[PDB]
């Protein structure tokens, strides 16, 4: 069988700018374990109907996992724009796969503020699909070169989410797992 429970149930999820990518190959993928779980608040699939996953075979399955807030969960979709889509994680316009997200307020939020999750705020250009940019070079927002020193018009590209339990539903952390298809179901 395929190690889905090594992906969805993992204790450590990476920040969105440094999203993980887990190979799933040479296994039987039973996707019915995904449908029949109470907490999965977004099982969205593009190009494949969710109910027909058990009848299809794929050569590879890649599971990208990261943590964002509820307000940018809609940003994980083909042809979407914004901070997560443009600077952190871009899905191709011809994306074939499923995007799975669920609220993890009890696991990723701390009353004093969980600063452990980062996102990229500034970048020279939009990310290509499935491209990862872990560089933390000082972004030059103006004309005077930064020379690696932050300050005026010299912003560090990464910001902290600051997850707390008392935040609203849109501001609570959401754990997102993106399945890429292009491993036979049974």
């Amino acid at each position, epitope marked *: 069988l395929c*190690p889905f429970d*090594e992906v969805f*149930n*993992a204790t*450590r999820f990476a920040s969105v700018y440094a999203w993980n990518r887990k190979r799933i190959s040479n296994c039987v993928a039973d996707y019915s374990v995904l449908y029949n779980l109470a907490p999965f608040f977004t099982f969205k699939c593009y190009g494949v109907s969710p109910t027909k996953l058990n009848d299809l075979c794929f050569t590879n399955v890649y599971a990208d996992s990261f943590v964002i807030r509820g307000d940018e969960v809609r940003q994980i979709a083909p042809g979407q724009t914004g901070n997560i889509a443009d600077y952190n994680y871009k899905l191709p316009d011809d994306f074939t796969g499923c995007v799975i997200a669920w609220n993890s307020n*009890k696991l990723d939020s*701390k*009353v004093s503020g969980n600063y*452990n999750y980062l996102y990229r705020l500034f970048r020279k250009s939009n990310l290509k699909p499935f491209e990862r940019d872990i560089s933390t070079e000082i972004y030059q927002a103006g004309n005077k070169p930064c020379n690696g020193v932050a300050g005026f018009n010299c912003y560090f590209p990464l910001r902290s989410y600051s997850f707390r*339990p008392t935040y609203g539903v849109g501001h609570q952390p959401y754990r997102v797992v993106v399945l890429s298809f292009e491993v036979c179901g049974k």
Partner: antibody
Amino acid sequence: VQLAQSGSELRKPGASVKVSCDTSGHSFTSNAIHWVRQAPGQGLEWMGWINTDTGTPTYAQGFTGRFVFSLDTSARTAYLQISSLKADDTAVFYCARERDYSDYFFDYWGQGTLVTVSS
Amino acid sequence: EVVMTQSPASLSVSPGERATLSCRARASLGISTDLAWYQQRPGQAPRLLIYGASTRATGIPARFSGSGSGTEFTLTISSLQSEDSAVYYCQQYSNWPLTFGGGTKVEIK
């Protein structure tokens, strides 16, 4: 490192047992306090955890339905509820608390509460 | 769930001799050094020896050295004393069926 729990307790089959775990002896930068069950002869079994300051309990595969985790009003002492006790439910229930946040190993452990189901 | 096969189930080695304890986990993708070693002397509650694959907890003597990464893990105790005769468990804080090992009963000759 020696979280103070409740003492040993004898309960007839079908009754309910109240296991406490005082945590106020130290200062913890964590929101999770975990419960571990150890059989009288077997090894350690992870029961689950309850989210401090949120009160949301999480249970393992075999420790759901009859096992209820609860907190205090001050969110310091965590209580454990076992209902409809069977004769095979006698065990030592350890109260484990992690030192730092999102460090899911248990540096701080309770003294252990042994429930006995007999007559 | 991640299931440990902690072997040997019981050691019996002389004092002053290295005791190697192994904890293999049935994880397809591996754990990647998310293992915790506990020690439960008869009576008292388990004591966290080693968090992570290698680094030891505060107050733990240098004898308890950990090793391993991914799937095969190994704990070694050098220069055993009479107070190291206990039961050693291994835990994965990787997924969320947090599972302890079967335990190894270390005995001093």
